[PDB]
Design a protein around this ligand. Sequence first.
Ligand SMILES: NC(=O)c1ccc[n+]([C@@H]2O[C@H](COP(=O)([O-])OP(=O)(O)OC[C@H]3O[C@@H](n4cnc5c(N)ncnc54)[C@H](O)[C@@H]3O)[C@@H](O)[C@H]2O)c1
Ligand SMILES: NC(=O)c1ccc[n+]([C@@H]2O[C@H](COP(=O)([O-])OP(=O)(O)OC[C@H]3O[C@@H](n4cnc5c(N)ncnc54)[C@H](O)[C@@H]3O)[C@@H](O)[C@H]2O)c1
Ligand SMILES: CC(C)[C@H](C(=O)O)[C@@H](O)C(=O)O
Ligand SMILES: CC(C)[C@H](C(=O)O)[C@@H](O)C(=O)O
Ligand SMILES: [K+]
Ligand SMILES: [Mn+2]
Ligand SMILES: [Mn+2]
Lengths: 349, 345
Amino acid sequence: ASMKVAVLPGDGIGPEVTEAALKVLRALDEAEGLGLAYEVFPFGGAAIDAFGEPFPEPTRKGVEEAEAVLLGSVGGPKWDGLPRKIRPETGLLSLRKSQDLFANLRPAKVFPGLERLSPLKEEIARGVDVLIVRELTGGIYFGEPRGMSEAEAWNTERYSKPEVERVARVAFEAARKRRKHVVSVDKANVLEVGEFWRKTVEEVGRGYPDVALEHQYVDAMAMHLVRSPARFDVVVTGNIFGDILSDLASVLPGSLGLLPSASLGRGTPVFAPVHGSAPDIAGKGIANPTAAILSAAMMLEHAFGLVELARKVEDAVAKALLETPPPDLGGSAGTEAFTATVLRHLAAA
Amino acid sequence: MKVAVLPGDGIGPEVTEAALKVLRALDEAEGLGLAYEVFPFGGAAIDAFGEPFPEPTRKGVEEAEAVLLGSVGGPKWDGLPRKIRPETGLLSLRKSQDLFANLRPAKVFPGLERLSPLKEEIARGVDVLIVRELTGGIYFGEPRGMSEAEAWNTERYSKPEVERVARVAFEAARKRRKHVVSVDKANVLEVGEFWRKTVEEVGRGYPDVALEHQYVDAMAMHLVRSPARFDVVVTGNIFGDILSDLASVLPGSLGLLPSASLGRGTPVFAPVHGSAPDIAGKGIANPTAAILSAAMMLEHAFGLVELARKVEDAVAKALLETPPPDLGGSAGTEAFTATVLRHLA
Ligand SMILES: NC(=O)c1ccc[n+]([C@@H]2O[C@H](COP(=O)([O-])OP(=O)(O)OC[C@H]3O[C@@H](n4cnc5c(N)ncnc54)[C@H](O)[C@@H]3O)[C@@H](O)[C@H]2O)c1
Ligand SMILES: NC(=O)c1ccc[n+]([C@@H]2O[C@H](COP(=O)([O-])OP(=O)(O)OC[C@H]3O[C@@H](n4cnc5c(N)ncnc54)[C@H](O)[C@@H]3O)[C@@H](O)[C@H]2O)c1
Ligand SMILES: CC(C)[C@H](C(=O)O)[C@@H](O)C(=O)O
Ligand SMILES: CC(C)[C@H](C(=O)O)[C@@H](O)C(=O)O
Ligand SMILES: [K+]
Ligand SMILES: [Mn+2]
Ligand SMILES: [Mn+2]
């Protein structure tokens, strides 16, 4: 034991794609002597049914004591209509908030030679390599007042200066290690909170003169991200806009089953697919495990500094996608078979 | 046929003049008795009256039967504070006329599949109508404000605001393919939960219309991967704004998308697109959105359905024949407009 991991499989396809990532981690552990140890803990729907709440105390303790969390998606029709304070999705929010993981990193990269897998023509998809840095613990997701009566409902989009500054800082540090361009995304032409966001990111950027800074309104950014995506490096934005733009960015490599994420901040870092619990395909052994696998690759790199191992996983996934694509990308490889293709390539390298 | 023309800033006057030439040729051929006046709006109005929506412009709008609007904004006024900027005049126009229903159609015209960046088999038969709630939500909700330490805005909806925009979407679907998808973020936000429940209630009044829900992040992906499966898409102010820019990738360019804003007061017809300051002055701006917006005015404000269709057919032919630069072609604004007219005649 010198790599300590909390595994939180979730609901629907969550446990299916998470098991696939685990077989990749185990294969790497044995091949490399990583000294991996992990414990599995209930989370989401599975936790509501067993403990009455989505993020129970033994799961919080497992999270606190691990060096990293490999997380599966939560949610489904089974839990429709729960009091909000115990919904599977509120447990996910609590996870994020209790560890103060304010920086959500969502990369979208179109692998050379896989441009054809996109719904868009190859010239738009070619070369795409974008990093969305989404503010994860603030904005409308956590703001108060919030509630609902018979006549109306209300939620508050709000940000303070230090919340914007700390996410902006992460996006500049990231850009400095990439291609030194940040686009900051807001609705400053309509909303006081966008004006505030913009001005604060402008101030932070004065601390990073080596990084080019551009602003776009969220509606134009959505259009640009599908017409000119190759022209973007880092994209920094608030909680809700980052959620929308990151599901949108899946159309670049061509499916939502491809996109990984890392959530970083004060406590235990969390690695998880962008995608949800996909109840329409759960139980059919077809869910694309690429997001989960690449999330384990982000864990290797960011939580454990194992950059070269992360790159080997990524390359093994890109070859498996070219060779035996899963059904969401027009191919026939189920979860188990795709995962075996990834392992074969790993072992060959 | 009495019309207020509000040309706006950047490409706004350029594409608006193009739509006017189409309207004039139509007036002569058809004897519409068109009568229009031009009013200052946006930056052009800030510079001449110190405000983006001045009194003679409000009076022009009140007294017209329809407004043909040009886009507003640009770097020139970036240094004004928001509350007096060109975009706040747009919001005031909408609010004063209580135009709560914004109609933004995204169609791949039969034959123009090649113009879309989507593979042809994804783009075939795509015909989506976004119905966006225009006068409520975070755009207008109180409290809103800003201090040195923080800023806030309120995403707020009341039951009647949701019911009336839901009705409009159900009526529109009943005349189309009888499917509505309603979009929210009900899994995180009380206001989405409330939107969803109220749309469900209104839908019980339209058993001929199928009703589906999507969360806004999945909707954005589905609108690009499987656009052919949507008819009407109903949503709140900010989600509607984002989804409808995104929807431009279906026919192929933002410069193609028209809009109508309908409600209590004078109806407003205008491109989805903004003032495009990065191309203003170059004679290249695609005027299709402005021309198709004039077509929507003909249909929705004047009941001239077959004329609208004729405008739309001439645009489609011109697009196939002399495409503007945003669609991989070389036809500038004047030349593209001339192609439209030749097909009209
Ligand atoms: N981090 C999370 O736990 C997370 C994230 C998003 C949504 N959710 C929850 O998941 C449930 C489903 O919500 P949704 O449908 O809007 O989002 P979703 O991401 O689960 O699925 C959206 C679409 O993509 C497809 N898809 C998703 N992952 C895939 C994969 N790995 N392989 C192949 N296809 C895949 C799904 O079938 C569906 O068509 C809801 O209960 C929602 O609250 C959870
Ligand atoms: N209804 C409106 O008045 C309205 C709507 C949106 C934006 N705006 C304002 O427009 C200005 C620029 O905003 P923006 O860049 O975020 O969005 P935009 O819609 O003005 O331009 C977006 C992109 O698409 C291009 N584009 C837009 N219309 C085009 C056309 N007819 N032909 C060819 N290309 C076109 C532009 O060159 C730019 O690359 C800002 O001041 C903004 O507030 C106004
Ligand atoms: C399940 C929900 C809380 C979540 C979010 O909006 O953050 C999900 O959509 C995601 O993208 O991770
Ligand atoms: C300019 C702005 C106020 C407007 C909106 O967000 O409604 C524009 O983006 C649009 O899409 O019409
Ligand atoms: K650590
Ligand atoms: Mn999401
Ligand atoms: Mn817009």
